């Protein structure tokens, strides 16, 4: 059985498969030299940062530190609207609910606590504290004000009730611990990347793995949507970085360059979707081209590895994190 | 050039963030120690002698100590060990019983290893206890270390055994030039235990504070 | 639950002390408003969370002193040398800023007591100078006092809601009991003449 199934789908794959994107685009002109500059640099952390989220409003966004605080800043002045003090040291996700009124930060004590903003006293308390999950939480996403999805290092992935606390569905499959996961634009379906270097589609209704992806050979440590909606990134931690097609379920093509050998942390896209950001381990972010695998420029700037990155909801400002507990929007 | 509402916003902003500064530089005078084992090897014992990640709080001789144990986590060591390398010490215990149970020494030599020699883990100096003296004792008095250690047993003894687990034990190290083994044999818990890593803290803390100068 | 509960001839010199429970006294910004018997309300005095930046509206400047006491959740309001023009009742009003925050949310049931410098005129109240500052932000406020207790904040930055609406422009702007309009840009604050809706 399985064999003779996994045959019949590379069969299938092959021959549904003529030719990749380049061929195709060989005469799209490229982007060219992307100039950037470091227009603010937050600072106030005293410890690593693993994570960073931007908020609705693209101002606002949300670090997590070693240093059991969580900070939220106004990107425009570089102030400190609050300074959370965690309850446990070790954090290792952030998440930013779209309606700005909560925030939700995991760790390794296996507990997705849920964070309130507007509150009669003016002090930020915990809405309420969730737990469930035998392994260390790894991301994090907000669908609404009430549902909460969060994936941890016992392979699992679940989907919660914030009112009530409980597993409304369970995601289960992968083989290897779950490093990260990114919600389609339309809240409908998700992708997540564990360690047995293959990503899964899920729905988030009935809650079934809808499809497989495979191709990478080692973790995968980043994975993030296109804005259309219809394909993904992900990046290994083996210096190569691999764009799917969901529809097609192949891999369309790969971004490596010979000179890099450190992994990829993060992965994103911009507004248009043409430029594809990446981390690194190198200490700085490089910028691919979509269509081209041609590397557009580097961010260099940062003093130790890049972990976090995201890019503003309306596409005009890049954040990254970095180790050396410092922030920098680029633009 | 500034309204009322911005300035009384970085007023609020700089308030934080000397809260902040003064909270960082509370919390940086303060030892962080790791803990490891091999598991049922005597981290309770240690533990009492005063989910996930288990921290502990105990203050001796004026100074703020703060062990964690990272015993409950199954998942993959690689994918959370980079987040702990800004502790003072490791703690790392076992048991001298596991040589006639299957076996399990190679084991915990292989943890050892693997912990020791890791990249992350370059200088940071190791405690390394070592549980169940007097059970040792009467095991060596009741079989011989041989199913261990084929290659020279030795005499069956306290002198010679004891000595060469420990020669074995840290022969693992290779960054010899850098990194320290501290060792010692458990006592009856004679108050004796926090006093040797109130040492050993001291002596890495010496090291630290000359390196930089 | 949240609440404030604050409690002469004349040369004279009185203490007035406002007391805070049920939320985090500490950082907030204490205002102090005096209403007039028959002439509505004016600024006062406002002690910056912290006990950083102090203001004194000009009348009373010097004569007055304020002050919180911060490990007591009080502030005190010390007068000194009360002059005939002083009768009035006195609120206590809180306000906390930051990015979105709501100044002016909550007041005192007040206590009373008895012995530069826009126009703001006045549903639709004038102004003198705008106030369009170059970071896109209108600084208005919008008041109702209905008779009976402490007046609320209904809108701020005449977008915000604290069925109301409000709108307008620089030096115009209407908003669609006594209703009183205020503006925020500089330190001395300035009260609406306040208008009255009835039947």
């Known amino acids: 059985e399985a064999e003779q199934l996994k045959n019949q789908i590379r069969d299938a794959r092959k021959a549904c498969a003529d030719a990749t994107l380049s061929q195709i685009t060989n005469n799209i002109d490229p982007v060219g030299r992307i100039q950037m500059r470091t227009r603010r640099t937050l600072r106030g952390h005293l410890a690593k940062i693993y994570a960073m989220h931007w908020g609705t409003d693209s101002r606002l966004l949300v670090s997590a530190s070693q240093d059991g605080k969580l900070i939220i800043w106004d990107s425009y002045t570089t102030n400190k609207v609050h300074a959370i003090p965690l309850r446990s040291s070790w954090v290792m996700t952030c998440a930013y609910a779209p309606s700005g009124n909560y925030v939700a930060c995991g760790g390794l004590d296996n507990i997705c606590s849920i964070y309130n903003l507007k509150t009669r006293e003016g002090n930020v308390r915990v809405s309420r504290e969730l737990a469930g999950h035998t392994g260390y939480l790894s991301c994090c996403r907000f669908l609404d004000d009430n549902q909460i999805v969060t994936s941890s290092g016992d392979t699992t992935c679940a989907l919660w009730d914030i009112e009530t606390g409980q597993q409304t569905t369970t995601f289960t499959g992968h083989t290897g611990d779950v490093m990260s996961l990114s919600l389609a634009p339309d809240t409908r379906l998700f992708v997540s990347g564990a360690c047995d270097a293959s990503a899964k589609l899920w729905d988030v209704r009935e809650g079934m793995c809808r499809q497989t992806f495979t191709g990478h050979e080692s973790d995968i440590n980043a994975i993030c949507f296109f804005p259309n909606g219809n394909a993904f990134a992900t990046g290994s931690d083996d210096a190569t970085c691999r764009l799917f097609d969901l529809r097609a379920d192949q891999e369309l093509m790969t971004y490596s360059h010979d000179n890099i050998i450190c992994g990829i942390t993060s992965v994103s896209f911009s507004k248009s979707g043409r430029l594809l950001l990446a981390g690194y381990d190198d200490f700085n972010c490089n910028v691919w081209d979509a269509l081209k695998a041609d590397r557009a420029g580097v961010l260099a700037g940062h003093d130790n590895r890049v972990s976090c990155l995201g890019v503003t909801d309306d596409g005009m400002a890049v954040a990254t994190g970095s180790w050396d507990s410092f922030l920098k929007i680029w633009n | 050039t500034l309204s009322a509402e911005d300035k009384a916003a970085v007023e609020r902003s700089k308030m934080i963030d000397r809260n902040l500064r003064e909270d960082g530089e509370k919390a940086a005078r303060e030892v962080k120690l790791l803990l490891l084992g091999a598991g049922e090897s005597g981290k309770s014992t240690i533990v009492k002698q005063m989910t996930g990640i288990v921290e502990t709080h105990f203050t001796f001789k004026d100074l703020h100590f703060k062990m964690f144990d990272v015993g409950a986590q199954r998942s993959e060591r690689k994918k959370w060990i980079h987040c702990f390398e800004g502790v003072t010490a490791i703690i790392f215990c076992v048991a001298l019983s596991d040589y006639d149970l299957v076996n399990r020494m190679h084991e915990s030599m292989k943890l050892f290893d693997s912990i020791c020699n890791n990249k992350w883990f370059t200088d940071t100096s190791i405690i390394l206890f070592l549980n169940k003296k007097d059970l040792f004792e009467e095991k060596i008095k009741k079989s011989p270390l041989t199913i261990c250690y084929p290659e020279y047993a030795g005499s069956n003894t306290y002198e010679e055994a004891a000595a060469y687990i420990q020669c074995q034990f840290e022969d693992l190290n290779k960054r010899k030039d850098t990194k320290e083994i501290y060792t010692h044999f458990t006592c009856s818990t004679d108050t004796k235990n926090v006093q040797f890593v109130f040492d050993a803290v001291t002596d890495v803390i010496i090291k630290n504070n000359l390196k930089d100068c | 639950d949240v609440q404030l509960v604050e409690s002469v001839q004349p040369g004279g010199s009185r203490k007035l002390s406002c007391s805070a429970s049920g939320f985090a006294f500490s950082s907030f910004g204490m205002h102090w408003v005096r209403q007039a018997p028959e002439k509505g309300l004016e600024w006062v005095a406002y002690i910056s969370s912290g006990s950083g930046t102090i203001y004194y509206a000009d009348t009373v400047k010097g004569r007055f002193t304020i002050s919180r006491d911060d490990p007591k959740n009080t502030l005190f309001l010390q007068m000194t040398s009360l002059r005939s023009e002083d009768t009035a009742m006195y609120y206590c009003?809180?306000?906390?800023?930051?990015?979105?925050?709501?100044?002016?949310?909550?007041w005192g049931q007040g206590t009373t007591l008895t012995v530069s410098d826009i126009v703001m005129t006045q549903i639709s109240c004038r102004s003198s100078?705008?106030?369009?500052?170059?970071?896109?932000?209108?600084?208005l406020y919008w008041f109702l006092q209905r008779p009976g207790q402490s007046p609320q904040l209904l809108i701020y930055?005449?977008?915000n809601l604290a069925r109301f609406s409000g709108s307008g422009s620089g030096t115009a702007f209407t908003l669609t009991g006594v209703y009183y309009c205020m503006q925020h840009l500089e330190y001395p604050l300035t009260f609406g003449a306040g208008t009255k809706l009835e039947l």
């Open positions: 009003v809180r306000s906390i800023y930051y990015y979105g925050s709501s100044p002016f949310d909550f």
């Open positions: 930055r005449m977008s």
């Open positions: 100078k705008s106030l369009l500052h170059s970071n896109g932000n209108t600084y």
